Design a protein around this nucleic acid. Sequence first.
RNA 1: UCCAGU
Length: 101
Amino acid sequence: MSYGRPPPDVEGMTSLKVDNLTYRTSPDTLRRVFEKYGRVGDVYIPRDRYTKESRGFAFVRFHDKRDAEDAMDAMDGAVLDGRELRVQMARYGRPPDSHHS
RNA sequence: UCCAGU
């Protein structure tokens, strides 16, 4: 499909995430926009998996605390084009059933 | 608006 699967390092990943962007932003943008902070070790857009069109948000991520702390110290509260940005540490490894089994 | 993907 797209992107690349999470690394085999979830046993110590910093798991920072990023959201709140616009319905007009795109993942190639956030990939490069956040790559400068050190390591955009992952990025995703779980918009849907049956209609793939919500695109109202994204999930940029980091795996090292030094680049993750800067990423939120400089993107939390920013403005893409007229709304706010959000970035903070995750709370789960991944959703348990958003795609059923 | 916490991932459903190499």
